[PDB]
Structures are given as C-alpha cells and as structure tokens.
Design an enzyme around this catalytic site. Structure first.
Site, PDB file in Angstrom:
ATOM      1  N   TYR A  89       8.521  38.063 -14.501  1.00  0.00           N
ATOM      2  CA  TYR A  89       7.150  38.415 -14.859  1.00  0.00           C
ATOM      3  C   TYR A  89       6.217  38.000 -13.770  1.00  0.00           C
ATOM      4  CZ  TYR A  89       8.258  39.466 -19.830  1.00  0.00           C
ATOM      5  OH  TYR A  89       8.681  39.943 -21.060  1.00  0.00           O
ATOM      6  N   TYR A  98      15.625  38.721 -19.747  1.00  0.00           N
ATOM      7  CA  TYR A  98      14.890  37.541 -19.310  1.00  0.00           C
ATOM      8  C   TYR A  98      15.430  36.269 -19.981  1.00  0.00           C
ATOM      9  CZ  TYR A  98      10.874  34.475 -18.598  1.00  0.00           C
ATOM     10  OH  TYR A  98      10.148  33.368 -18.152  1.00  0.00           O
ATOM     11  N   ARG A 152      16.422  37.242 -23.505  1.00  0.00           N
ATOM     12  CA  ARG A 152      15.808  38.387 -24.199  1.00  0.00           C
ATOM     13  C   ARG A 152      16.499  39.691 -23.710  1.00  0.00           C
ATOM     14  NH1 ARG A 152      11.287  39.071 -26.119  1.00  0.00           N
ATOM     15  NH2 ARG A 152      12.600  40.108 -27.705  1.00  0.00           N
ATOM     16  N   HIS A 157      12.961  44.476 -22.528  1.00  0.00           N
ATOM     17  CA  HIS A 157      11.964  44.927 -23.513  1.00  0.00           C
ATOM     18  C   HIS A 157      10.609  45.162 -22.875  1.00  0.00           C
ATOM     19  CE1 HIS A 157      11.375  40.656 -22.928  1.00  0.00           C
ATOM     20  NE2 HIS A 157      10.149  40.794 -23.395  1.00  0.00           N
ATOM     21  N   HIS A 180       6.495  45.021 -23.962  1.00  0.00           N
ATOM     22  CA  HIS A 180       5.543  44.530 -24.954  1.00  0.00           C
ATOM     23  C   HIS A 180       4.477  45.654 -25.107  1.00  0.00           C
ATOM     24  CE1 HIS A 180       6.622  40.216 -24.942  1.00  0.00           C
ATOM     25  NE2 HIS A 180       7.112  40.538 -23.753  1.00  0.00           N
TER      26      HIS A 180
HETATM   27 FE    FE Z   1       8.647  39.381 -22.862  1.00  0.00          FE
END
Ligand code: FE
Ligand code: FE
Ligand code: FE
Ligand code: FE
Lengths: 238, 202, 238, 238, 202, 202, 238, 202
Positions: free
Chosen positions: C106, C145, C155, C158, C160
């Site tokens: 990120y 992630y 994770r 995905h 958001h």
């Molecule tokens: Fe996320």
C-alpha cells in the site's frame, strides 16, 4: 538444514479462552485478544531432561505407588507416537500424566468425592519419547468423575497429559479419552473444542492385537505438536 | 499435514501430575521444582514472586506456573540455541511451581538472565518466558517478565515495542525490591479486567 | 410516487461488531446494542457530487498516477451495476476505491511490508454510476497482503470500496475479492460475515467475454444498497 | 540390483502431437506414428551437472536479476519432490524454470505485450534436486499472458519447467499452474492433455503452513518421472 | 504407482529459461551451450548443423535442440553406463542450442561418437540422440543422427533395421561435408510431410 | 428481492482512498475535505472537534469521520428533501476528515444547522449526523451530535427522547467553547466502555 | 457509447470444419488452422437493406408462390427474437429462409427425390427483424429428406436460415428443427455440433398458446448472434 | 450471457433461399445479386472472378459467395462506419453470387475499394471481404481479396503482415487482367491442400 520458526498455532483447532459452558473459564479468560509475535530464540528453545534421573517404574502407574498389593481396577497399557505437524518424530520429549483411580477418585487434598481411595494407586507417571517418537506407560483405567459445573456434571474417564519437547512454542497440556465412553458426547470441557474432528483427535483407540493375554488391554493414542519450518533463503531468526 | 492435538484445561488437580510433592505424593526419586540455581550456577541470584488474579480480583490458589529463560550470558541451555557460545553447564533454564493453596503466592529462585539476540540483528531486553495453567484456563497463557531496572534495554526491546497500546507494556515489567539483601522482583498477573496482563500467541 | 423510509438493515446479513477472530474489533466494538430509530429527513437525504469536478483519469488506476511508465502488474477492468434491494438502479452514486499494488504493498505511511513499491501506481480512484447504475474502472490486480492478526495472516487480493448514494442510511464501505483466490476461505475479515451466501456476494466474477484481447482481463461485480419503500397511505416521514 | 529399461511412456497420459485447438501444433506435428524402440544404453543414460558451477542465487528469481531494487509482484516460494513412477526419489536432477513477470510480460525479444517490463526481474532459474528428490526456488508469481491462438486467448499464470535426470528417456518439459486460477478451465494448451486427472497433476497447491509471515506465500508441487524396472533374470540391455 | 507428469509445449520463449544468453539475459556465471569439445577432449572434431522444417517447408526459428552421445570410444559419461570402461574425462556428452532467429540454422561443435553396445550382444552404429522442443510441439520429439560414411555399421544397426519402411531409414542419416578442412555433417529435420524424419518413442 | 452487500471494515489504510492527501497521494485535482464553509455560505460558523477512544481509553489515530447536516434554515442540500424550501446554494452539507496520526484529534469547519422537521409534525433539535470508519470497526458506526446551548430544543427532541436510558442521552451533546472568538463544540466519542457514546441503527 | 470489437467467436460452441461423419466435409475443409485477426472497420460493418423493397408476401411461404390453390401440408407459424450474446435486440437484421415442401422435396434442379413436388409451394422467404428483434413467418412444415451420406441417411424436418445483421463478423447460416422429431438424434449434420446444449439451441419449441384455432400451429425459435463490447478507455479500432 | 446460435452447413440447395432465380424460382419482385455498380456509382469498375476448388482440385459447382467492401473513398455504407466521411450514396457495398452449375465460375461486377483505416492509426491496403458457403462447409469460410497492382499498400497491410508464414500471403492477392478494356481480377480459392487459401476467424 537451517531451522526457521514454528508454524503459527491454528487457533480454530483449539478451544477459545472464554467458553461459558465451562463455568470456571468465565473469570479466568483474558478480555483482550492475545498479541501474536514473530518468534525468537526464546520461543524456539526448550529444556533438556536426562534419562538418567528417571526411576524404573516412572511409567508404570500400576506399581510405582503399590505398597501392600496391587491397585484395584482395569489393567491397561497406553502407547503411541508423538510427531510434529509435518509428520516428523518428536525425540526425547518429556511426557507427564496424571489421573484419578478406578473409583474416579483423585489423590489430591481438594477431592472429596465419595468414590473410594485406593491405597496402592498414586496416579502420576512420566517418560521420555524414544527416537521414533514412541512412548508407552501402564496404568489402571480411571473411572468417570462427577464435578460441579452444572450440579450433575460427569467427566468421561480421562488421563491428563503434558509435553515439553524441542521448542517452548510446542508446550502443550491436554487430556485424552477412551473409545466408546458415552460421557464423551456430553462433556462441556471436550465441547470447548470447536470442531468435531479435533474432539475425535483426543480419543484413544482400543488396540486389540496389542492386548496381553490374561493380563492387560491396550489403547493407542498419538499426539501431534507444532512443527518447525526449514529456511532456504534469508535467516531472520537472529 | 496433521493438525496440532487440541489443548484442554489442566484442571484443579494439575499438581498430582506435575508437582506430586505438593499433592503429598512421593513416587519419584528426582522431582522437578522451582529452584533453578545449582551451587556452581553463574550469575546474579534473584527471587521472582507474585500472585495470579481472576476477574474478581481474587488470587488463583490452584494455578501452576513454569518459566523458561537464558543463562547469565543470554545463552539458552537448549540444542536449538544457535549462538555458538557455550552455555553455563550448571543451569537447566526451566522450573515449575504452584501457588500456595491458602495464599496464592508463587515463587522461583533463579538467576537474572543476560540479553538474548532478537530477530534481524536486534537485541532483546533481559526477560523470562512464563506460562500459566489452571482450572478454567483452556490453553496455557504465555507472557514474559521484564525488569524495571533495565529501563534502557526495555525501551529498545522488539517485543515490548510491538505492543501498540503503550500503556499495556507496563504490565510486563516486574518491580525490583531488596528483602534482607536478597534481590526480589514482584510480578503480579491479572488474567482479566483492569490492568490485565498482556498474553502472547507465540 | 411519495417515498417513505428505507427498509430496515437486516443485521443478520452483516458482520457483528464484536468478532473475536478479527482482533482489532475486540476494543473497537460497542458493548451496548445499537439503538434503532424511525427515519427522518436526516436519514433519507444525502449529498450530491458534480460530475464536472471529476478528472478524466479518476477511474483509471493504471494511468492516474503513472509518471515515467506504466505500473507493473495484471491489467484488469472491473465493472458492474449498483442497485437497491428492490432492484432499482442507483443513479449518480459516488463510488471510491483503494487498494494495494501488485506486490501487495500500500502507498501509505504506516505500511512497512517488504513487497516492492511501484513508483507508477497510486491505488485510488473514484467515479459516479450512470443512469443505469453502471460503473467501470481499470486497475492493476492487487497482490495478497500479509498482516498481523495471528502472525501469519494474509488477506486475499482485494479492492476496498465506498458508496455515497441517495440516502444517508445507504452509506456503505466494504471490500470485494476475486473469483478463485484460495485465501478467501481462510480470511478472518471475510469470516466475520455470518452466512456463506453473503460471503459470496463479495466475490467479483471473471467476465471472459469482456476481456480485451492482448490488453486486459475483466471482472464483473454488482453492489446492492438498501432501498426505499413507497408510501400509499399516511405519510409520517414529516 | 541390476537395472533394466524404463517403463514404457503411457501415451494416454500425455497430450497427442496433433491437437487442433492449439493452432501452432497443426503444422508442427508428425503425420506418421512414432516408432517405439526397445531401450539401449543410449536411452538409459544421461549427463551429470556439477553443483559447483551453480551460483548462490540461481534458484532465487526475486534476487538473481535485481539491480536497483526488488522486482514488483507477489513474493512466493515453490517447493516439492521429484520422484519416479515407482515412488523413488530422483537425486541430483537438473531443474530449470522460466516465466513471465508480474505483468504477464516475458523478457524475450519476440514479446510485445503492453504489460510492463520489470527492470529488476529476469524470469529464469535453476537448481539440482537433493538426495530426497526435494527442490525449492523463490520467485514473483507470474501474471496471466494474452496470446494469439483465437484472438482473445489468455494463458493462466504459469511457470515453465524442464528436467534432465538419470536417463535420457525421462527427459521432460512441462508447465505448472496455481490452485484456483479461473483461466485453467479455459486454456487450450492445458486441454491438449486428455484426462482430467492428468490436468490436475499440473496444479501447484497453496501450502499455508509453509507461508513465511510478513514475507512470502508458498506453493507445493511434486513431479513424477518415468521409472526404471529392476532385472532378476536375463539382462538383455547389453 | 504414480503416473508421469504430463508434457506441455516449451512455448515460443523456451530460450529465457534454457538459453538465457540467446534471450539477452545474463543471470548465470556458467551457462550451458552447444560446444561439447573441451581442449583435452579426445576424438575427431565435427560440426553438426541443419534446419528444422514445419509442414509448409518453412524453417522453425524458435526451436530448441539438445543432443546426448557417447565419447570417442563409445562410452557414455553417465553413472548408468555399465560397460566397465573408463570414459573420456573431459566430455559432458550433452549440449543445447537454439536455431538462429532469422535463418533457422542450428549447430553443435562436438566429437564423432564411437560405437555403443546394442541389446543382446549386438553393436549399434555410431549415432547421436537428439530431441526437439518448440512452440506447437506438445512433447519433445526424439530422433537419432547416424553418419553416411558409416555405411557398413548402419546396415547392421538394430534400431535402423527395426524401422520396417526401408525408405524412411535414410531420413536419419546425416551427410558428411568438408568446409575448410572442418568435417561437417548436415542433418535437416522435417517434422511433417514428405520425407518426414522418423521420430521415436524411447 | 436482493440482500444488501455486506459491510467489511475500512481497514487501517482507509485514507488512501478516501483522503489521499493525508496519505501523501496527489491524484485528484479536486479533493473532498472537512471544510463545509464556502465564502458565501450562510450561517453561524463553528468548529466541531474531538477524539475517538477505544475500550482502553486510547485515541484511535486511524479513524475516518464523515458528517451530514442541514443548512442554517434546516433544509438539506439533497433532492430527497421534501420541505419545498430553497436550500443555501453554497453548501454541500457533507464533509470528511481523518484523525491526526500522532494525536488523534479530528475537526470540521462548518455551520450550526437549523432545526429540521421530525416525523408526524414534530421538530428535531439542531444536530449533525456522524459516521465513523476504522480498522477494527466492521460496519460504520452512526451517531448524532447535538449542542449544549440548545437545551430547550434537546429536551423535546424525538430521537433523544427515544433513548430510554436517560443517562446515555448526554453522550450525544457537544460542549460549546469560545477559542479566540471562534465558536468550538467539543465532541468526544467513546466506542466502548464507561460513558460509551450511543450509536444508532438508522 | 463507443463500440469496440465483437466478442471472439467461441469455437467450441460450433461444429469443427473437418467432421468425418458428414462425408462431404472431408474434401471441403481447410487443413490449416484459421488465422484469427483483431477486428477493424471491415469486420464491424455490414450492409443495410430497405424495408421498401420487400413484397407483402415475402414472409408468407404458404401464399408467396401459390398459383391455383394452397400448398398441401401442415400450416405453421414460426416466430421468435434475434438478440446478441449480451441479450440486446438485433434490429432490422435480414433473415432469409428456405426449405423443402411437405413431401421432403426441394424445388431445386439437383433434387431427384421421389416425394411429390407441390405446384403451389416455392420454399423461400425473407423478412427484417423489428425494433425488438422480433420476426414472424408462416409456412408449410417440411417433411424429412433422405440423402446420400451413408445410403439410408434422413434429415429431420428442418428450415435453413441466414442472417445479415449489424456487423460482418455476425454473419451466420444455420438450420433449425422441430421439437420432438425422432430423426434429430440420428442426424450426422446436427452431430457435427460438439455439445448437447448447443444441439438443443437449434430446436424450435411448440408454442401452444399461440396456435390459431382451426387454422395454424405455432413454433417459437430465438437466435443469438455475436455481440459487441463497449469501450471505456483507449479506442484502438481506428 | 448467451451462447451464439451454432452454425450448420448451407447444404446443396442453398440457392433456393439465397438466389431463387438461380433455382428458377420467381417469388420476389426485388432480388439480391452480384452487381454492386448502380449507374451513378463512383469509382473504377472491375470484375472479380474465379473458381473455388476442393481437396481433389475440382471446382465446387454448388458454392455460394458474398462480398462486403467499402466505396471508392474507403468508407463503408454502414451506420457502424465511424469515419465521419460521407459514403457514396449509390453503393450497397455487398453482393451475392453462385458458381455456375456446369463450370464452377463465379463473378461479381463491382468497384475497386479505397483504402480503409486499420487499428491504431494504421492504413489497410484496398481489399474485399469474402465469405463462402456450401454443402460440406460447416461454418462460412472468411477470407479477403487484395490486388496485385497495390504492391506498396499490401507490403504495409496490418492483416497480411499478421500472417507469419509469408508464403501464404500470396494466396490472398488477386491478379489484374484486362479483357476488352474491362479490368478483371482473377481470384481462385483452394479450400484444402497445396496452396490452400488463408481463411480467417474474424
Ligand atoms: Fe486492504
Ligand atoms: Fe481430570
Ligand atoms: Fe509461457
Ligand atoms: Fe436441407
């Protein structure tokens, strides 16, 4: 081979801390979530115990406390293998056990059950697994034990066990039961485990071919501990 | 792949099997206990003591505690220690004790551990790893004991700094006292509630 | 047509606030039950955003932050329809999205994962649905992630997303996943949703016929918001 | 133990030469049937490669071509065992792999796809299996690759691999895929294999317990080569 | 019992992984190539060259070829060779090459192999085992290269004689030429069509 | 009939997509923010500020907050407002902000809203609707902010009076202060625990 | 809306060129694979035909060739919708049909079958679909037709049809059959289609509610053509 | 999503429905045919003619052919043409014909098309799109006709250059002839075998 960390404990394969049907857990369970950490030498190491300090009857609960005669009850041998999750044998791990006598009575100051005490039974033993991860002990099958959770609660016959193996992260205390005991389906302690397959992993199996004629029955029970991953690239443990 | 054997509580009679002398049972010649100091053990002798409290603030009088720690030079007496340094030969690094049935006090006689390497070249502050078993506890609870006189090292410790709620780090710091010239660290554990002690998934 | 209130949110179709397997929720969830209220103008209204203030690349995550070249990763188009529970299209709703890059990294000050940053990828976009409730954006498929819930938690890939539509009561933030990702079955965040059918409602489907040859793949993902009932008798809203 | 010949290749377990759905095969497939021969020393021998000539990063596709930084994409470890059809480990076999980068772009002069090139990724590696037949390499998960068979054809993410082992008859080149990729069911190349069970033998499985926290995921993929029969009566090989 | 892992085409970029220098990739210090002659290798030096053609008669410019052969005395440099004779120590016996991207010509620098024992006391004629991988080829195609100046030995070769269509045996015989005093054997491969080269299931 | 898409947490990086400037990302020319006052906006300018606390009493430094409110005359700038009155044309009625990463303070510059009709002919007291998103919060939490200087109107508010535990109503009342001649309302939110703020299902 | 290319033809949904059970295909099928191209204006355009040039009976095969009386046979109406693969109606497409008479006899110089010719039946018609993609024609149900593939081959009753619609890429000629005809399961021409579901897509269904009392039966048959994708980013067509 | 209706052969009587006059059937007042030139059509008049051959080299005497092409300025008379240029108003751009039952010759009277834009700013060389239907052909076969006097444009054509076997490109080039001052392009189609015409999946 350079070893890395133990694989993460799968929390869904274990009981939760807060389990309202087991009443004592209500005030003895953390409100906060556990904090997961990356492992260090502290978590991957563990003590070593020497075979030389074990007595000859440490794994024989039938004789290690007998004074005037033999204990009363069902003569059984329990044996099995301790392995890690990747199937490797756990060598020289310390296995300690404890249990009630044939009446379901514990030799403990805080046990007032009316089932009779047996002057020739102690109820504790210990042993080290061998190089194949094998262990064997002999004992008297314990009777079921009434206790106060709901007023008429009864534990199925069970033997408590503890393992100290290669890594502190593998430290584990649990209990195993005996194939076919009808109390297994009603026990609130066994029911803290969420999945049926994990509840079955605590049931020792009748091992008929290993019964000793005119002497003892035999149960087989294997135990799986967490296992270490091997490292092939960066070694961050240190 | 296999799943780990699931945990179950130790139950209220955990001493029959793990501290038979506390249950008044003499079956073993050699017994495991809470004294980690042998005559030739190296290092500063300390006493670690405290109580464990439940959610009502009452001590647990049936709790069993074990500790695992490094020697005075920060080397574990374990074949898995990879430091390449020689460990104190007269040190098991582990001990077990039970709280007193009437008061709930528990104690260990040990040595103050040396600092141990952390991951990726870091250094951990001196600490003792501790686990608690008892009736009502479904899986042994893991925590660590750091020392209040190691302020500088604690400030830099990787594990303490990984607890994001800074206020909770203090629950892991034992307080140094000096009773009769003996060095004592008091470490109380609060399983639930206000000032609840941090427990780890290791 | 005189509109009345939005239909009640079905709490069984959403995750609960307190979900112990998602650790951060333990201290960030109310102990008290939510207080339900009858709706007023405050709850049935919402802001309007103007199409004129959106830039030409606001829905193109491949180019909206590219400086020296194109971002590295899998070129994908995501499209679908936003409707209310009664099947009516949601027109001119503001849809905002954000995600990690192809490495699962990120662009956020608090992200220290070792997966590489991509100097040509930003990771955020926005758009307004059209009159049929249709939206379309293009991006780089995000990588899974790792994060600290249990130590080895990961994770699934995905994106958001957030919607501000016609009524404040429809306000919603969620996340969608990609058909076939094996991490979907292990995710504690997805598992806060109690029902299997609702967990599947967050999986975007491969849309093969809409792939663009020698260029981009395509995923289809529709979103359902709460819907308003019509009034035919007393109008109590006011 | 006197070794005889390798067991016959089971042609029904492999794709045929002529497979019209894979267009390039139409002009590059023999019209005549293959001529089967009885094996000689030529077919049962193979070269030996020395471990001393391999570099330290030959099996690390993340670092073996990194110049200014790390490649962008999903960090994954792939490991497994190479055995022969009778289950024996294949020791010291040469395993070579090659693949596209995270964008689905190959570092090859003839690849003009628009997915971005990664200046820090090369896409080839090699290694020797150990005595247990084990191999391990690390890489960036490749993105799916559009190509011209039908105009909108897309390969599922895949890694190409080659083995040179003990006998020339075991020589094999194939490709493996990743569990759950939806493109696996549409691929004309995978569909040249006639049986469903053999198509599944090329899918690497997510190996969750071997993921490395905050670092890399892991896939498990085993490979089976032809195996030699032992001789107990006449030895006709020579 | 397990089934063999199924084959899949090498695809058009087979050089990234098997001849990275041909794809302009320098990742390895030591690279595998088409030169089997080391300075001390024993034997007659020859060049083997040719093109591979598709069913339209056009050369494949993306084909990868490997060869496997015995040393000058007919001994393989393999632990599986059971002849009990010492092999040339400076000979790998294997090499890999790719056709030129523009012309389709491929070549190897090697040594002319000695005769190798066949089954049941027979003797095989000198030959090189060759395999072809490329886009469009689902399983590596195996063939053998014999030499036209070994007429007598070829006439008695067990494998050539096992091809019942006598006319097809000639597709496996390379033609000896002498370019500049260098001995060259030309071997063209026709994958499909007229004069299609014999391929074996080995 | 369809079911609503299920909610999922916004996660800790909710600012990448909803406040890219706070994450240091300049992709948009026009950005949404926490200033609802335009030069010609009508009404009394106020600053609304506070912190959000977790169950340990610590501020959330990664929370995202949005507010929705009517103009100075109690008219929403929404096509769904049915009052038939003209709304202030220079007022969006909505804003978004994030708590400061170091301190946890959040703020909005807005206007004090006029009273809005309630159901069945009632009148609601002036209020701002607020929603909170953050890591750990699975569904946005809805609450309302009323003002302590509107005692009379609050006493008659339908929503406040529908909270049967009278003691909890006070958690929804912001405190008016005057910093430098600027009117500030302080509204702290306690997600869990003592004095927990009332949250609504709307 | 900016239109891009038609979606790729799914070759697995159509018969292959070489189909040995349909003998005439053996010498009239290309040996080379078809070369797929990216579409240009040439492929996405098609001619327009004017409604003004169609006669009033062009879609009435019962009357468009009647001279002295009505044709003999079963009076049937056939109707349905033409849509593209994304479900949109195909407007003003040219639909042409042809068929045998009630005896299974074609009015064609090369047809020598003994089934009787009908002097009042021609066997061809045409029409344009309307704005909803609807078409309707009336005819005499054709009889099955014996032909020489194997000596005793018989086609099920069928009507041949052709469509010229919006794009040249949609050009299609096929045949439809009638629900329940037992010859459908034996036909080698229908069997060139590889999948059962696609073979069923050519069967017109009895539409009982639309029968016209004391006059005509009715069959419903819908047709799906390839559909165009819309473009939202780069427009490469030109 | 729906699947395309599957194709089936046109069969040997395809002329009953598509060229009823060739089958001797007069049902329609206006018939579709092979003459694309109207009196006012702009451009150079050409005749396109040839035969279609099966795998034995014999002409198909029951084949139906259609062509689709742009006007003299390269604009299609289709609403889908996006060039923004006006198309010749007296040009349908399409025609249909059948081979002669005895000889197999087919022909169209049309105009030589102007160049049409290709993808991504390229320019296609002048071409006519052609489709073939007949007994034995399960799906209409698509091909294109280019012109031998447009050497320069053909050399740069995107579609011809996308055929990797260069030798096959020539099968798509018609040969210009001049019969009586009429310009004729001969284009023979070989469905199978040697010099097989390239067919496209469009
Ligand atoms: Fe996320
Ligand atoms: Fe017990
Ligand atoms: Fe590939
Ligand atoms: Fe027919």
């Amino acid at each position: 081979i350079i070893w890395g960390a133990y694989a993460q404990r799968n929390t869904e394969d274990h009981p939760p801390a807060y389990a309202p049907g087991y009443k004592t857990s209500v005030l003895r369970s953390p409100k906060n979530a556990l904090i997961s950490i990356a492992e260090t030498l502290s978590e991957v190491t563990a003590p070593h115990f020497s075979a030389d300090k074990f007595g000859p009857k440490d794994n024989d609960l039938i004789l290690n406390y007998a004074k005037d005669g033999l204990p009363i009850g069902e003569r059984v041998i329990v044996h099995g293998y301790v392995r890690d999750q990747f199937g490797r044998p756990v060598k020289n791990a310390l296995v300690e056990v404890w249990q009630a006598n044939a009446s379901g009575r514990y030799r403990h100051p805080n046990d007032q059950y009316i089932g009779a005490m047996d002057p020739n039974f102690g109820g504790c033993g210990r042993m080290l697994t061998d190089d194949n991860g094998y262990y064997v002990f002999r004992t008297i099958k314990p009777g079921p034990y009434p206790w106060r959770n709901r007023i008429n609660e009864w534990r199925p016959a069970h033997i408590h066990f503890s393992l100290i193996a290669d890594g502190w992260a593998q430290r584990l205390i649990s209990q195993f039961y005996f194939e076919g005991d009808t109390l297994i389906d009603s026990c609130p302690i066994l029911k803290t485990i969420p999945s049926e397959q994990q509840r079955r992993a605590l049931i020792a199996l009748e091992d008929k071919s290993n019964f000793i004629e005119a002497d003892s029955r035999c149960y087989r029970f294997d135990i799986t501990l967490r296992g270490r991953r091997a490292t092939y690239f960066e070694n961050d443990l240190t | 792949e296999l799943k780990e054997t699931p945990s179950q509580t130790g139950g209220p009679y955990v001493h029959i099997g793990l501290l038979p002398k506390q249950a008044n049972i003499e079956v073993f010649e050699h017994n495991l206990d809470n004294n980690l100091v042998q005559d030739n053990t190296q290092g500063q002798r300390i006493r670690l003591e405290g109580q464990v409290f439940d959610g009502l603030g009452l001590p647990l009088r049936d709790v069993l505690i074990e500790i695992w720690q490094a020697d005075t030079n920060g080397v574990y007496p374990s074949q898995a220690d990879t430091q390449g340094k020689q460990v104190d030969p007269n040190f098991l690094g582990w001990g077990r004790t039970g709280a007193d049935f009437g008061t709930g006090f528990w104690s260990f006689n040990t040595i103050k551990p040396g600092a141990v390497p952390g991951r990726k070249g870091s250094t951990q502050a001196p600490h003792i790893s501790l686990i608690i078993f008892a009736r009502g506890i479904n899986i042994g609870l893991h925590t660590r004991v750091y020392f209040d006189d190691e302020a500088e090292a604690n400030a830099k410790d990787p594990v303490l700094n990984s607890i994001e709620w800074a206020t909770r780090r203090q629950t892991l710091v034992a307080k140094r006292e000096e009773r009769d010239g003996e060095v004592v660290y008091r470490f109380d554990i609060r399983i639930q509630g206000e000032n609840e002690t941090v427990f780890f998934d290791i």
